Amino acid sequence: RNKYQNARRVLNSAETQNLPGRESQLQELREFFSNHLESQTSGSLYVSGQPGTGKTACLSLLLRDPDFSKRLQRVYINCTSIASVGAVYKKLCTELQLKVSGRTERDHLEAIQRHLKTAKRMLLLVLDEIDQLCTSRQEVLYTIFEWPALPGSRILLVGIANSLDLTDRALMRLNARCELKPRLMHFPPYSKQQIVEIFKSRLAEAEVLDVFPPVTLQLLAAKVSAISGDVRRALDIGRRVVEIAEQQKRLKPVQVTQVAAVLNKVYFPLQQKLMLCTLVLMLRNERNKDISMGRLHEVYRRVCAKRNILALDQAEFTGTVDLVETRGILRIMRKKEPRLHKVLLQWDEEEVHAALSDKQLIASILSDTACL
Amino acid sequence: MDPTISVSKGCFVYKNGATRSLLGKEVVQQPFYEEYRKAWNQINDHIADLQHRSYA
Amino acid sequence: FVPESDGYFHSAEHEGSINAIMEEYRSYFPKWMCILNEGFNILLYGLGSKHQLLQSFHREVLHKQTVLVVNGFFPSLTIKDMLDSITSDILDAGISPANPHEAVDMIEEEFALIPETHLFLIVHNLDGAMLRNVKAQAILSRLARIPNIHLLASIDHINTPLLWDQGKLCSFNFSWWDCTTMLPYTNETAFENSALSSMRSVFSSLTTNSRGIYMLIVKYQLKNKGMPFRDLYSSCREAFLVSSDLALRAQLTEFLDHKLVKSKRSVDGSEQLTIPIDGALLQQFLEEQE
Amino acid sequence: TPSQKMKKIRAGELSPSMQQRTDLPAKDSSKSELQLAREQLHVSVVPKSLPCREREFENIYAFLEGKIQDQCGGCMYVSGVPGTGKTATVTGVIRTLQRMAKQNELPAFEYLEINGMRLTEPRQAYVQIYKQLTGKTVSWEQAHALLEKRFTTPAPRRVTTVLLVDELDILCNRRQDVVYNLLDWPTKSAAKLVVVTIANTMDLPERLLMGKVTSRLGLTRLTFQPYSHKQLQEIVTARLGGSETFKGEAVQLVARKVAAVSGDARRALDICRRATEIADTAAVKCVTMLHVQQALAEMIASAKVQAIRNCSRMEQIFLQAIAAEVTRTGVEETTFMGVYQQVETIAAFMGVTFPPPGRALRLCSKLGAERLIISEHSRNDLFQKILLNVSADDIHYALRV
DNA sequence: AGATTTTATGTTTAGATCTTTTATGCTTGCTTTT
DNA sequence: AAAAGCAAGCATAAAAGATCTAAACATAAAATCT
Numbered sequence A: 001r002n003k004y005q006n007a008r009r010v011l012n013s014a015e016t017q018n019l020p021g022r023e024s025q026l027q028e029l030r031e032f033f034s035n036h037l038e039s040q041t042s043g044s045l046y047v048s049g050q051p052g053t054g055k056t057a058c059l060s061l062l063l064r065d066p067d068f069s070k071r072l073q074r075v076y077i078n079c080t081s082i083a084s085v086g087a088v089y090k091k092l093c094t095e096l097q098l099k100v101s102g103r104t105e106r107d108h109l110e111a112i113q114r115h116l117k118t119a120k121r122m123l124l125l126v127l128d129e130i131d132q133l134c135t136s137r138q139e140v141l142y143t144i145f146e147w148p149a150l151p152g153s154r155i156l157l158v159g160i161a162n163s164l165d166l167t168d169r170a171l172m173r174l175n176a177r178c179e180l181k182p183r184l185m186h187f188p189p190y191s192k193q194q195i196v197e198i199f200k201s202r203l204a205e206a207e208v209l210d211v212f213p214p215v216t217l218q219l220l221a222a223k224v225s226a227i228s229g230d231v232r233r234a235l236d237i238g239r240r241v242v243e244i245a246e247q248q249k250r251l252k253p254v255q256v257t258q259v260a261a262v263l264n265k266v267y268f269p270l271q272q273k274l275m276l277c278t279l280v281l282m283l284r285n286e287r288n289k290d291i292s293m294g295r296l297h298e299v300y301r302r303v304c305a306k307r308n309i310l311a312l313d314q315a316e317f318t319g320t321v322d323l324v325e326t327r328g329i330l331r332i333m334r335k336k337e338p339r340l341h342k343v344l345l346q347w348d349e350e351e352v353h354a355a356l357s358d359k360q361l362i363a364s365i366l367s368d369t370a371c372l
Numbered sequence B: 001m002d003p004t005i006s007v008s009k010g011c012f013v014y015k016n017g018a019t020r021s022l023l024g025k026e027v028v029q030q031p032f033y034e035e036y037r038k039a040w041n042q043i044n045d046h047i048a049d050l051q052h053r054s055y056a
Numbered sequence C: 001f002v003p004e005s006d007g008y009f010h011s012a013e014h015e016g017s018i019n020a021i022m023e024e025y026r027s028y029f030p031k032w033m034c035i036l037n038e039g040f041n042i043l044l045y046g047l048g049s050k051h052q053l054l055q056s057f058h059r060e061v062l063h064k065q066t067v068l069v070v071n072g073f074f075p076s077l078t079i080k081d082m083l084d085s086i087t088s089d090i091l092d093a094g095i096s097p098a099n100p101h102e103a104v105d106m107i108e109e110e111f112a113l114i115p116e117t118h119l120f121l122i123v124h125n126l127d128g129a130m131l132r133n134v135k136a137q138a139i140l141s142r143l144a145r146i147p148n149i150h151l152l153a154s155i156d157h158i159n160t161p162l163l164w165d166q167g168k169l170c171s172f173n174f175s176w177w178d179c180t181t182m183l184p185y186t187n188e189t190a191f192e193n194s195a196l197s198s199m200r201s202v203f204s205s206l207t208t209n210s211r212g213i214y215m216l217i218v219k220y221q222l223k224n225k226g227m228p229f230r231d232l233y234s235s236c237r238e239a240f241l242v243s244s245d246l247a248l249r250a251q252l253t254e255f256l257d258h259k260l261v262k263s264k265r266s267v268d269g270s271e272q273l274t275i276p277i278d279g280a281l282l283q284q285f286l287e288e289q290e
Numbered sequence D: 001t002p003s004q005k006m007k008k009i010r011a012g013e014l015s016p017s018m019q020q021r022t023d024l025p026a027k028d029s030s031k032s033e034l035q036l037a038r039e040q041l042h043v044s045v046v047p048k049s050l051p052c053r054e055r056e057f058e059n060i061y062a063f064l065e066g067k068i069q070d071q072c073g074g075c076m077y078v079s080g081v082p083g084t085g086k087t088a089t090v091t092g093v094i095r096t097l098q099r100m101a102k103q104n105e106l107p108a109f110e111y112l113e114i115n116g117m118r119l120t121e122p123r124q125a126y127v128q129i130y131k132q133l134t135g136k137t138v139s140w141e142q143a144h145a146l147l148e149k150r151f152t153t154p155a156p157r158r159v160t161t162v163l164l165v166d167e168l169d170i171l172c173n174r175r176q177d178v179v180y181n182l183l184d185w186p187t188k189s190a191a192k193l194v195v196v197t198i199a200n201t202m203d204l205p206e207r208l209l210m211g212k213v214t215s216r217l218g219l220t221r222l223t224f225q226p227y228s229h230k231q232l233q234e235i236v237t238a239r240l241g242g243s244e245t246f247k248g249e250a251v252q253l254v255a256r257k258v259a260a261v262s263g264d265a266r267r268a269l270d271i272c273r274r275a276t277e278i279a280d281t282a283a284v285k286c287v288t289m290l291h292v293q294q295a296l297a298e299m300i301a302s303a304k305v306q307a308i309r310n311c312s313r314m315e316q317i318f319l320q321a322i323a324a325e326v327t328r329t330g331v332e333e334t335t336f337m338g339v340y341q342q343v344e345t346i347a348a349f350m351g352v353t354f355p356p357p358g359r360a361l362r363l364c365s366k367l368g369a370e371r372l373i374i375s376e377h378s379r380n381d382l383f384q385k386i387l388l389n390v391s392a393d394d395i396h397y398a399l400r401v
Numbered sequence E: 001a002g003a004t005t006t007t008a009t010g011t012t013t014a015g016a017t018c019t020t021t022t023a024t025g026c027t028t029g030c031t032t033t034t
Numbered sequence F: 001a002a003a004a005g006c007a008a009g010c011a012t013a014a015a016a017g018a019t020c021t022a023a024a025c026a027t028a029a030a031a032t033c034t
């Protein structure tokens, strides 16, 4: 309906046609595909980078080009979708409609090699999320990357991954032969101005540019590009600003107060309070931070006795510490017996004191050295 | 490099009709192969006979 | 070679010469065919690589016989892979049984059923990276015992016959042959079995807050000539480089993945964060970041 | 033949019926007022409108109504400690949206739901989501392929589909393929999926999900805080209606002693039912405060001092000597040999003889089966290690006072 | 309208993995007899 | 003074111990041959 719901729809975070931030990367990928088409030679490639930087958007944009539709046979395989690491050849056969004698992965591999030896068109095999193909012996990944070096094969394959060094660390054996190792392409995380240009593209495709003044866009991109640089979190906070402003106001451009509030937002039971205070006391008073559940409960019972309030039994105390564990304040390393489980504090005490919000009690527990 | 040198496989079948006397006829019909096979069969059978008669 | 124990108790023209050596070893081949016909197996024990020599024997002489080449210098081959290769491709008998000696019993039965179907077996580096256990050598000796199967093999390691006892060395009916080519070990050492620049290349890909966290560890390391985790946590919360503890643990997990930082736990439970690079190069790196 | 039954089950053509009672259920008018409170206080009776969860209702309702009307799809992650009204609020929002779509005030939408603890395997969710669509039971590979054919391919008129996913941490595993598929399907434009994920831990996407899975899960999130002293009283007094069968101080004591422990609402609705059952056997018709005190002492039980007082005299000598060896050697883990020597000392003091060590191992095995102590298998006698599971002061409190 | 491989599927057990923890061993740094 | 000898210290690694997973094995649905 209105501009708020229009901007909330258009921020989308789905597939797109225009990619303002990735232009030199698209030109480099087009030059790679074009020179390996004109030379009619095979060529492996490994694109990588942090999640949300837009690798799959670039390759989905380049698998819809009409001229590459004329010149080469596109195949896109998402490697999470296969049932197993060795099953991917079978999926590749279904992407090529190859006839197979069937029901073993070896004959599917021989059918793929027999297709590659006498293919009429160049093959572009994009294997999205190739980190799922890594195992231990890694027969499948080496068998896939050995295909460009096969005699007469015309495959040129692209492997998308989040790891900067998956190619070297996971495929050291391809370094020995320079014809085999993939050309590497990083996708750097988005800068501040690139996120501003992505926002100014998405809000001008629907002409809802006016709901975001430039100052608050340059606050939002300055936070997101400094934290992580993925455009998914940027579009998520940009959608969340409008869907909070719609809930709050019911054209008003969003002010810096709303984006600052959602950015500072994004970026107790009494027995749980007594447990956290006794854990802070035992961690402060003692050099040995190997605290067991029983060693903590024996101090917690004395603290509850000196406070003249009833203490929980060990069977309920274990569930209390497990409920405190869900907040992230603690981490319990499990052992053979419930008494032997090791509590480990994961907040500093300056955060625990501000989280408990009962300073008159923590001043009493932390001054109670004699109950340890 | 060589097709036998692969990054993935470790064993390389070169099957030629195996289902489920290496020398040609020039060597087997040579007299020296005949006398060698005769002397070897005689010596091996005599040694096997001695081993059986000692174990009996 | 008669070594003295006191060393333990006190502890161009070359191409033509190598081609003449290779032509002599190529001239040896019919004698190897007769020796393999008599039941002996061939073993080569020269200095240099013998890959091209056994490939020439497979190419020029065994051009029509059934042949299973086995690359023993492969880091990742298994004896199950070789027994599965014989059982599935030579005999069409399907997958071999999971016990390898049961697979050798099956191969002995199926090869007893077919006389004059000889299987040549070429093993470059019988002392291979995954064949150095006693069990794989027992499987190879039980396979070489078969009258149908003939075996050629290469040897490179000096300590190879320590795993051949007299039973294996009797099953391996070896005819030793000094095939000393002088070729370099290219293919045998090409595999996986045998830095400030990389730190800059991974530092370029990091975001601004990760650059600030690593610069904090670099400043503490150059200031102290491994930092406890609590000082890095308080410095990041003061510099607003992190939202909470768990994001800092995720950043240090990424640094452990990219090997910029080694984590050494203390007896007190605190986590120490060493940077595994000498301090002169670290001071040059800090000067590079300014 | 059984195969026709299994084929009619896997095709969904026979509904799984359960056997009905021979006798009719009793009429509502024969019930006592205390029985009426006992059945209104059952945890299974969800109220039509939940007290003290209005803000979270507006949050989930605004998110789901915007995702349905915009026809875009997306994802949400709600989280909180158990019993805090998560799944009841999400199903209440979805029932309100279905009541609104029935009257054509909203676009219509499908409502799939799964739960991660009803699945034996993480991949079996593919079997179940398809079972909420077609109703056929198929293998997980064919179900995953048919779900990808449904979601990746634009097929107008596609309707919006809301996939509630309870118990998200069980679906994880090491590969995290299932949760990656469930969070990756909304990102495609062809699928109008709006997946909501319920879980307990606040920090789950950062603690155990992968970085791309956390990036797909997004930054829209909601946390259900534990019920306080007052909200637990409002819940129980809403469940009781206008009835005065509960004293107000009794509900106040139930809420005050339940909110101090966990903030679970099921604990309050169970303690009030036990208080009603306690008041029923006293032949009173009002749940006075001492019935609540008895039900609280029963359901927050601490019966280990009773176990040490109920032990046989040689087991009490054993429980004294284990704590004596812990005080003597300092370390908390004692071998059976020094425990037996302290046993002989204490038995020489008290004047009774002690059983020989082959019977003392039977005493140690009984205390280790009762979990008063932790102890090893008895095959390594005299060198087995004996942790004390009960606290050392509880033994003196049992055997003195 | 009934028997036979054929194939797709589920279970189980052996092996890969994560993690803690413990130890001999590889090297160091003095240390001390000939 | 030279080179063999005892505490010290981090480190690969070795047990282990739970734990999760991949492939081998038993088994059921089903086209296929009669």
Ligand SMILES: Nc1ncnc2c1ncn2[C@@H]1O[C@H](COP(=O)(O)OP(=O)(O)OP(=O)(O)O)[C@@H](O)[C@H]1O
Binding pocket: A013, A014, A015, A016, A018, A019, A020, A021, A022, A049, A050, A051, A052, A053, A054, A055, A056, A057, A058, A162, A198, A231, A232, D212, D213, D215
């Ligand atoms: N340069 C860009 N301009 C506009 N939108 C973009 C750009 N890059 C990415 N996006 C948006 O971000 C969304 C996610 O990008 P994409 O899925 O390609 O990242 P990714 O690297 O594949 O993530 P992951 O590594 O987790 O798979 C896309 O749907 C797209 O709409």
Ligand SMILES: Nc1ncnc2c1ncn2[C@@H]1O[C@H](COP(=O)(O)OP(=O)(O)OP(=O)(O)O)[C@@H](O)[C@H]1O
Binding pocket: D042, D043, D044, D045, D046, D047, D050, D051, D052, D053, D080, D081, D082, D083, D084, D085, D086, D087, D088, D089, D199, D200, D235, D265, D266
């Ligand atoms: N605010 C409330 N008002 C009334 N009843 C409530 C409220 N919160 C919880 N309950 C009761 O307690 C029960 C809680 O069930 P619910 O499914 O909400 O728990 P949950 O938070 O999903 O638990 P888990 O996280 O363990 O799945 C409901 O059946 C409901 O009857």
Ligand SMILES: [Mg+2]
Binding pocket: A055, A056, A057, A128
């Ligand atoms: Mg992607």
Ligand SMILES: [Mg+2]
Binding pocket: D086, D087, D166, D198
């Ligand atoms: Mg629930």
